[PDB]
Structures are given as structure tokens and as C-alpha cells.
């Protein structure tokens, strides 16, 4: 939030969760002043990637600390 927050080093091969938006933000991202091109809803070109929600339960993330808040770098 304003740059002030937490970060995770994203590398080619990790898993994200993609979420579409109600409407697109073509030139809300190309110009900041907030509006896209024509007038749609819910386009596949409106996906943002978030760090939580992508991995599969088959593939196990080891050593999940359950009692103490844990911050990982590996």
C-alpha cells in the first residue's frame, strides 16, 4: 500500500492466482487516468496475478509452521 508492504521474489515457474476484473483497465494502466477502450464486462484481458491461490494440493509445501507466525525466504 503505497510501496509500504511485503514482497515475494517472483521467478519464472511459480504459481499465481489470476482474477478478472468487472471491466478492463487498458488506459487506467496506460494513462493512470482511469478508463479502458470500448464498453464490456468481465474480459479475460482483465486478469491480475495475486501471490496466494495458485498451487496444487498434490504438490506439497514442506515445513508449514502451525503455532508461530513464520516468514520464509526459501
Amino acid at each position: 500500500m503505497g510501496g509500504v508492504g511485503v514482497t515475494v521474489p517472483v521467478k519464472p515457474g511459480q504459481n499465481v492466482t489470476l482474477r478478472p476484473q468487472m471491466r478492463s483497465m487498458d488506459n487506467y494502466h496506460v494513462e493512470g487516468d482511469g478508463s479502458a477502450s470500448d464498453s464490456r464486462s468481465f474480459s479475460l484481458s482483465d486478469m491480475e496475478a495475486h501471490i496466494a491461490g495458485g498451487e496444487s494440493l498434490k504438490d506439497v509445501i514442506p515445513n508449514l509452521d502451525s503455532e508461530n507466525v513464520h516468514v520464509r525466504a526459501n
Binding site: 471491466r23 488506459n27 482511469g34 478508463s35 477502450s37 464498453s39 464486462s41 474480459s43
Partner: protein, 229 residues
């Protein structure tokens, strides 16, 4: 273009455009051996399918400059500008936050109308805009001495009147209707025009049009009817 009207032995020409057509679908037909060509046409059909806009729009912008903006895109698709009369609440409104536009122009045109209740329509390649409770200048007389068939039919809000197709009648205008029925029916004379129906034949079925109007009140406003959320 579909020209309809009356061409009496004396008089002159009464023929005007009642529908300017972009062909929808055609098909021939036997009846015995005949060949009847059944046309369906298009009104704004270029804009209902190939009009797509491109817009970032900033804060502080008035509430009509971008109706001009959207009409730019529908003008790329051959639409003329009609009369635009917004609500007074609309004319004076300004902005706090930016205005996505990406996708279907008619789609978010409709969400406009539902956003705060104005009508917009396309009338022979021409786009008109009115308020929900308003109408546009222009009046037309309909009386047994000026084209009235049967009763002026009474409805909850206004009337439904049949007449001979005679081309002035456009949606979003005014009809002054007189008869020997409306008087004892205690109904006004001025109505907006909302629905228009043209049915006719060259040989047998007379030119017939039917107009539905929602009555104008004392305050110069249309009796909207209870909009249900």
C-alpha cells in the same frame, strides 16, 4: 429507405421517410406461383454491432462532453446526431473519480439509462436523447377532421391512437388528440410519443399507423409510470 405517403390526383406529394433500412434478411416466397420478397432492414444496425469506443476519461469532466465522445464512435458507424435533452440533474453534474470504457457501446448505453433514467434511441440513423419524464419540441394534431380512426383509446397514463400513415409522426414528440370521446373521457390533448407502429398495404390495407403516448401533466412533464426496481 422506405418512402410512404399519399399522392392524390390533385393536391401534391405527402411522401416521407418512415424507416431508413440497412437490410436485415430477405427471402422470396410462393403463394400459388407468386414471388413475394420479404425484407427485414436495420436501424442503427451498424452501431448495434460494430461500434466500439476507446476511453480513458478524467475527473472533473462535465456530463455531456462524452456523450459527444460516444457519438464520435457511433458516428464512425454512420449515425447522425439528433436532439439531446438531458435531465437538469444530469446537465449540472460533475465528477469525483474516473470512468472505465472497454467493450460494447450499446451495452453501457443501456446501463446509462438505468444508471439514472434517460431515454436514448436511434430514429432512422439519427440518435435522440430525452429524459424519462420529458419530450422534445414538435407537435402533431390528430382529430376526426385530421386523421382519426375510431376512438382515441385511453390507457393508464396516456392514449393509443390509430390514424392514416402520414409521415411526421416520430417518437419523442407531441400529439394533440381531439375527438367526441375524449371530452366525456376527461383526457387531455397533449401526449408524448413513445411507441410508433406502421402497418400498411398499397392495394388493400389502408395506410395505418398506431401511436402510443404517455400523457403530459400540468407541469409539462410526462406521466412516467411507476418504474419497478
Amino acid at each position: 429507405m422506405l418512402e410512404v405517403g399519399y399522392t392524390p390526383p390533385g393536391g401534391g406529394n405527402n411522401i416521407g421517410i418512415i424507416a431508413k433500412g440497412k437490410i436485415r434478411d430477405y427471402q422470396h416466397d410462393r403463394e400459388g406461383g407468386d414471388i413475394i420478397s420479404t425484407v427485414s432492414c436495420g436501424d442503427g444496425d451498424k452501431a448495434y454491432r460494430r461500434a466500439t469506443i476507446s476511453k480513458t476519461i478524467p475527473k472533473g469532466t462535465p456530463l455531456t462532453e462524452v456523450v459527444d465522445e460516444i457519438h464520435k464512435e457511433m458516428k464512425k458507424e454512420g449515425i447522425a446526431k439528433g436532439e439531446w435533452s438531458f435531465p437538469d440533474k444530469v446537465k449540472n453534474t460533475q465528477l469525483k473519480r474516473p470512468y472505465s470504457m472497454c467493450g460494447s457501446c450499446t451495452r453501457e448505453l443501456d446501463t446509462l439509462g438505468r444508471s439514472h433514467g434517460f431515454y436514448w434511441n436511434i430514429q432512422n440513423e439519427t440518435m435522440e436523447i430525452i429524459p424519462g419524464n420529458g419530450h422534445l419540441p414538435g407537435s402533431l394534431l390528430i382529430t376526426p377532421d385530421t386523421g382519426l380512426i375510431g376512438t382515441p383509446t385511453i390507457t393508464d397514463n396516456g392514449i393509443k391512437v390509430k390514424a392514416l400513415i402520414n409521415p411526421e409522426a416520430r417518437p419523442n414528440r407531441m400529439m394533440k388528440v381531439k375527438s367526441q370521446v375524449l371530452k366525456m373521457n376527461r383526457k387531455g390533448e397533449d401526449y408524448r410519443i413513445s411507441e410508433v407502429s406502421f402497418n400498411g398495404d398499397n392495394q388493400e390495407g389502408d395506410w395505418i399507423m398506431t401511436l402510443t403516448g404517455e400523457a403530459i401533466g400540468g407541469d409539462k412533464k410526462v406521466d412516467e409510470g411507476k418504474k419497478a426496481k
